[PDB]
CSV table of C-alpha atoms in Angstrom, one decimal:
chain,number,residue,atom,x,y,z
A,1,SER,CA,-3.2,11.9,23.7
A,2,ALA,CA,-6.6,10.4,23.9
A,3,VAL,CA,-6.3,8.7,20.5
A,4,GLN,CA,-3.0,7.1,21.4
A,5,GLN,CA,-4.5,5.7,24.6
A,6,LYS,CA,-7.3,4.1,22.6
A,7,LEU,CA,-4.9,2.8,19.9
A,8,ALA,CA,-2.7,1.3,22.7
A,9,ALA,CA,-5.7,-0.4,24.2
A,10,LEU,CA,-6.8,-1.7,20.8
A,11,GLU,CA,-3.3,-3.1,20.3
A,12,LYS,CA,-3.3,-4.7,23.7
A,13,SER,CA,-6.7,-6.3,23.0
A,14,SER,CA,-5.4,-7.7,19.7
A,15,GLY,CA,-2.3,-9.4,20.9
A,16,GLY,CA,-0.3,-8.0,18.0
A,17,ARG,CA,1.8,-5.0,17.1
A,18,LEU,CA,0.0,-2.0,15.5
A,19,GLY,CA,1.4,0.9,13.6
A,20,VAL,CA,-0.6,3.9,12.7
A,21,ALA,CA,0.2,7.2,10.9
A,22,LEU,CA,-2.4,9.8,10.2
A,23,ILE,CA,-1.7,13.0,8.3
A,24,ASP,CA,-4.4,15.7,8.4
A,25,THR,CA,-3.7,17.8,5.3
A,26,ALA,CA,-5.9,20.6,6.8
A,27,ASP,CA,-3.1,21.7,9.2
A,28,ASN,CA,-0.4,19.1,8.4
A,29,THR,CA,-0.8,17.6,11.8
A,30,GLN,CA,0.2,14.0,12.3
A,31,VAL,CA,-1.0,11.3,14.7
A,32,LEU,CA,1.5,8.5,15.1
A,33,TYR,CA,1.5,5.2,16.9
A,34,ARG,CA,4.7,3.2,16.6
A,35,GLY,CA,5.2,5.6,13.7
A,36,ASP,CA,9.0,4.9,13.4
A,37,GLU,CA,8.9,1.1,13.8
A,38,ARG,CA,9.4,-1.1,10.8
A,39,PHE,CA,6.5,-3.2,9.5
A,40,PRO,CA,6.4,-5.7,6.7
A,41,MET,CA,4.7,-3.9,3.8
A,42,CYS,CA,3.4,-7.0,1.9
A,43,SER,CA,1.1,-5.8,-0.9
A,44,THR,CA,1.1,-2.2,0.2
A,45,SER,CA,4.4,-2.1,-1.6
A,46,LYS,CA,2.5,-2.4,-4.9
A,47,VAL,CA,1.6,1.3,-4.7
A,48,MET,CA,5.3,2.2,-4.9
A,49,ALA,CA,5.9,-0.1,-8.0
A,50,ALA,CA,2.8,1.3,-9.8
A,51,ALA,CA,3.9,4.9,-8.9
A,52,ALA,CA,7.4,4.2,-10.2
A,53,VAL,CA,6.1,3.0,-13.6
A,54,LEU,CA,3.8,6.1,-13.7
A,55,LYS,CA,6.9,8.2,-13.1
A,56,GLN,CA,8.6,6.6,-16.1
A,57,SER,CA,5.6,7.4,-18.2
A,58,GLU,CA,6.1,11.1,-17.8
A,59,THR,CA,9.0,10.7,-20.3
A,60,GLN,CA,7.9,7.6,-22.2
A,61,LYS,CA,4.4,8.8,-23.1
A,62,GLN,CA,3.2,5.5,-24.5
A,63,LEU,CA,4.7,3.4,-21.7
A,64,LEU,CA,1.4,2.5,-20.1
A,65,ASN,CA,0.0,1.0,-23.3
A,66,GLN,CA,3.1,-1.2,-23.9
A,67,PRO,CA,1.9,-4.8,-24.0
A,68,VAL,CA,3.6,-7.3,-21.7
A,69,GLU,CA,3.4,-11.0,-22.2
A,70,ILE,CA,1.9,-13.2,-19.5
A,71,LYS,CA,3.4,-16.6,-19.6
A,72,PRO,CA,2.5,-19.7,-17.5
A,73,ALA,CA,5.9,-19.4,-15.8
A,74,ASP,CA,5.1,-15.9,-14.7
A,75,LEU,CA,2.2,-17.0,-12.5
A,76,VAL,CA,2.8,-17.1,-8.8
A,77,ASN,CA,0.6,-17.8,-5.8
A,78,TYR,CA,-2.2,-15.2,-6.3
A,79,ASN,CA,-2.9,-14.0,-9.9
A,80,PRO,CA,-6.7,-13.2,-10.1
A,81,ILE,CA,-6.3,-11.0,-13.2
A,82,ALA,CA,-3.1,-12.2,-14.8
A,83,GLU,CA,-4.6,-15.8,-14.9
A,84,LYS,CA,-7.3,-14.4,-17.2
A,85,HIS,CA,-4.6,-13.4,-19.7
A,86,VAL,CA,-2.1,-16.3,-19.7
A,87,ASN,CA,-0.5,-16.7,-23.2
A,88,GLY,CA,-1.8,-13.3,-24.0
A,89,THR,CA,-0.7,-9.8,-23.1
A,90,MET,CA,-1.6,-7.0,-20.6
A,91,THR,CA,-0.6,-3.4,-20.9
A,92,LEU,CA,1.5,-1.9,-18.1
A,93,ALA,CA,-1.6,0.2,-17.3
A,94,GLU,CA,-3.7,-3.0,-17.0
A,95,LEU,CA,-0.9,-4.6,-14.9
A,96,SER,CA,-0.8,-1.6,-12.6
A,97,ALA,CA,-4.5,-1.7,-12.2
A,98,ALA,CA,-4.5,-5.4,-11.5
A,99,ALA,CA,-1.7,-5.0,-8.9
A,100,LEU,CA,-3.4,-2.1,-7.1
A,101,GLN,CA,-7.1,-3.0,-7.3
A,102,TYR,CA,-6.9,-6.8,-7.1
A,103,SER,CA,-3.5,-7.3,-5.4
A,104,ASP,CA,-2.4,-9.4,-8.3
A,105,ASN,CA,1.1,-10.8,-7.5
A,106,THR,CA,2.0,-11.6,-11.1
A,107,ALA,CA,1.2,-8.0,-12.0
A,108,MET,CA,3.5,-6.8,-9.2
A,109,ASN,CA,6.4,-9.0,-10.5
A,110,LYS,CA,5.9,-7.5,-14.0
A,111,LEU,CA,6.1,-4.0,-12.6
A,112,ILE,CA,9.2,-4.9,-10.7
A,113,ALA,CA,10.8,-6.3,-13.9
A,114,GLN,CA,9.9,-3.1,-15.8
A,115,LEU,CA,11.8,-1.2,-13.1
A,116,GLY,CA,14.9,-3.4,-13.3
A,117,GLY,CA,14.4,-5.3,-10.1
A,118,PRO,CA,13.4,-4.5,-6.5
A,119,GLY,CA,16.3,-2.1,-6.5
A,120,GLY,CA,14.5,-0.1,-9.1
A,121,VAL,CA,11.4,0.3,-6.9
A,122,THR,CA,13.5,1.3,-3.9
A,123,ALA,CA,15.3,3.8,-6.2
A,124,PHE,CA,12.0,5.5,-6.9
A,125,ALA,CA,11.3,5.8,-3.2
A,126,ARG,CA,14.7,7.4,-2.6
A,127,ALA,CA,14.1,9.8,-5.6
A,128,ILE,CA,10.9,11.2,-4.0
A,129,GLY,CA,12.6,11.5,-0.6
A,130,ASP,CA,11.6,8.3,1.1
A,131,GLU,CA,14.8,7.0,2.7
A,132,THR,CA,12.9,4.3,4.7
A,133,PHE,CA,11.1,2.2,2.2
A,134,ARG,CA,13.0,-0.8,1.0
A,135,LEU,CA,11.9,-3.5,-1.4
A,136,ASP,CA,14.2,-6.4,-1.4
A,137,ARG,CA,12.3,-9.4,-2.9
A,138,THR,CA,9.7,-10.2,-5.5
A,139,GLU,CA,6.3,-11.8,-5.1
A,140,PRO,CA,5.5,-14.0,-3.2
A,141,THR,CA,8.6,-14.1,-0.9
A,142,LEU,CA,8.3,-10.4,0.1
A,143,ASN,CA,5.4,-11.4,2.3
A,144,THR,CA,7.3,-13.6,4.8
A,145,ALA,CA,7.0,-10.9,7.4
A,146,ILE,CA,9.6,-12.5,9.7
A,147,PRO,CA,9.8,-10.6,13.0
A,148,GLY,CA,12.9,-8.3,13.0
A,149,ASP,CA,13.7,-8.9,9.3
A,150,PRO,CA,14.2,-5.5,7.7
A,151,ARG,CA,13.6,-6.7,4.2
A,152,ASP,CA,10.5,-5.4,2.4
A,153,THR,CA,9.6,-3.0,5.3
A,154,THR,CA,8.8,0.6,5.9
A,155,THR,CA,7.5,2.6,8.8
A,156,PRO,CA,4.0,4.1,9.2
A,157,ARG,CA,5.4,7.6,9.2
A,158,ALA,CA,7.4,7.2,6.0
A,159,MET,CA,4.6,5.4,4.1
A,160,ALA,CA,2.0,8.1,5.1
A,161,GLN,CA,4.3,10.9,4.0
A,162,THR,CA,5.1,9.1,0.7
A,163,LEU,CA,1.5,8.2,0.0
A,164,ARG,CA,0.6,11.9,0.6
A,165,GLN,CA,3.2,13.0,-1.9
A,166,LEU,CA,2.1,10.5,-4.6
A,167,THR,CA,-1.6,11.2,-4.4
A,168,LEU,CA,-2.1,14.7,-3.0
A,169,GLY,CA,1.4,16.2,-3.6
A,170,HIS,CA,3.3,16.5,-6.8
A,171,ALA,CA,5.8,13.7,-6.8
A,172,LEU,CA,4.0,12.6,-10.0
A,173,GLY,CA,2.8,14.6,-13.0
A,174,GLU,CA,-0.8,15.6,-13.1
A,175,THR,CA,-2.1,12.9,-15.4
A,176,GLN,CA,-0.1,10.3,-13.5
A,177,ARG,CA,-1.3,11.4,-10.1
A,178,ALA,CA,-4.9,11.4,-11.2
A,179,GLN,CA,-4.5,7.9,-12.6
A,180,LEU,CA,-3.0,6.7,-9.3
A,181,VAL,CA,-5.9,8.2,-7.4
A,182,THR,CA,-8.4,6.6,-9.8
A,183,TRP,CA,-6.8,3.2,-9.3
A,184,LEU,CA,-6.8,3.5,-5.5
A,185,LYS,CA,-10.4,4.6,-5.4
A,186,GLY,CA,-11.3,1.5,-7.4
A,187,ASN,CA,-9.6,-0.9,-5.1
A,188,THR,CA,-11.7,-4.1,-4.6
A,189,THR,CA,-10.0,-5.6,-1.5
A,190,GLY,CA,-10.4,-2.9,1.1
A,191,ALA,CA,-14.1,-3.2,2.2
A,192,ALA,CA,-13.3,-4.8,5.6
A,193,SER,CA,-10.2,-2.7,6.5
A,194,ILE,CA,-9.8,1.1,6.9
A,195,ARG,CA,-13.1,1.7,4.9
A,196,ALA,CA,-15.1,-0.3,7.4
A,197,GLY,CA,-14.2,2.0,10.3
A,198,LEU,CA,-15.0,5.3,8.4
A,199,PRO,CA,-18.4,7.0,7.7
A,200,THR,CA,-19.9,5.6,4.5
A,201,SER,CA,-20.1,9.1,3.0
A,202,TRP,CA,-16.3,9.4,3.0
A,203,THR,CA,-14.5,8.4,-0.2
A,204,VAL,CA,-11.5,6.2,0.3
A,205,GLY,CA,-8.7,5.1,-2.0
A,206,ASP,CA,-6.6,2.3,-0.4
A,207,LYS,CA,-4.2,-0.5,-0.9
A,208,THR,CA,-4.4,-3.5,1.4
A,209,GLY,CA,-1.6,-5.9,2.3
A,210,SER,CA,-1.5,-9.3,4.0
A,211,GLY,CA,1.2,-11.9,4.7
A,212,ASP,CA,2.6,-14.3,7.1
A,213,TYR,CA,2.6,-13.7,10.9
A,214,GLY,CA,-1.0,-12.5,10.5
A,215,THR,CA,0.3,-9.3,8.9
A,216,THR,CA,-2.7,-7.1,8.0
A,217,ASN,CA,-2.1,-3.7,6.4
A,218,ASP,CA,-4.0,-0.9,4.7
A,219,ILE,CA,-2.9,2.4,3.4
A,220,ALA,CA,-5.4,4.9,2.4
A,221,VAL,CA,-6.1,8.4,1.2
A,222,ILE,CA,-9.4,9.7,2.6
A,223,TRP,CA,-11.6,12.5,1.3
A,224,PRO,CA,-14.2,13.5,3.9
A,225,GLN,CA,-17.2,15.3,2.7
A,226,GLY,CA,-16.5,19.0,2.9
A,227,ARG,CA,-13.1,18.6,4.6
A,228,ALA,CA,-9.4,18.5,3.7
A,229,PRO,CA,-8.3,14.9,2.8
A,230,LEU,CA,-6.5,12.6,5.2
A,231,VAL,CA,-3.8,10.0,4.7
A,232,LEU,CA,-4.0,7.0,7.0
A,233,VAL,CA,-1.6,4.1,7.2
A,234,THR,CA,-2.4,1.1,9.4
A,235,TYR,CA,0.1,-1.7,9.8
A,236,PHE,CA,-0.5,-4.8,12.0
A,237,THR,CA,1.5,-7.9,12.6
A,238,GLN,CA,1.3,-10.8,15.1
A,239,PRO,CA,3.7,-13.1,17.0
A,240,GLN,CA,2.5,-16.4,15.4
A,241,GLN,CA,3.6,-17.3,11.9
A,242,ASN,CA,0.2,-19.0,11.3
A,243,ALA,CA,-1.9,-16.1,12.7
A,244,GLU,CA,-5.1,-15.2,10.9
A,245,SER,CA,-5.6,-11.8,9.3
A,246,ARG,CA,-7.2,-9.2,11.5
A,247,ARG,CA,-8.7,-6.6,9.2
A,248,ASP,CA,-11.1,-5.7,12.0
A,249,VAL,CA,-8.1,-4.2,13.9
A,250,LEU,CA,-7.5,-1.8,10.9
A,251,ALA,CA,-11.2,-0.9,10.9
A,252,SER,CA,-11.1,-0.2,14.6
A,253,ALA,CA,-7.9,1.9,14.3
A,254,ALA,CA,-9.6,3.9,11.6
A,255,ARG,CA,-12.7,4.4,13.8
A,256,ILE,CA,-10.6,5.6,16.7
A,257,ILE,CA,-8.8,8.0,14.4
A,258,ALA,CA,-12.0,9.3,12.8
A,259,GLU,CA,-13.4,10.0,16.3
A,260,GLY,CA,-10.8,12.8,16.6
């Protein structure tokens, strides 16, 4: 198609490997580019951990208010919110918001611990029908993004279908789904990624991800004005271990998609 020609040209101009999955919920049509190739998730995996804790809260009604200690030994490489609460507590709701909206890595590790390890996050993916997602490591080593390494990867197609179920479908209860949507819409890290390639009137909820090998990711639910919502996943990774992030590539992919 025309869009896939332009995405392929964008990829060629970038020097990296680009994966795109669009789901148009108007007619359940999909646009895929390398849709079944594995990509390192990096921080886009935080959506699955937050959703898994939300799913637990459908039975443990007070779970999101449970206080969790933040100790100096809990801090890893990037803890913008957790650092503000060292030797204090944050609720699981506050940890989920920090993980999603600020990409706080300590918050992610607390969510993983709540679920019983990376195997508990992966379990939730399987329980909602995602057989592709795998979380193998904690923060920060899940971001190594080594070429060919299947650890901590998913495919664009799988992540788009799973993000649709979590936010627009009914994989979660109603209060939980609305909370997830509210968190995604309040993301603070996405201004230069998918959002930058879309009309400013469209409302976006997204989760970015970045890591080694110049890995630059964004997953988004998009509500166009007077139009059925869209789910857009853009993964990008590069051949050099020390490559710089390329959020502009995600913005350009979104622009190409939005042209259709």
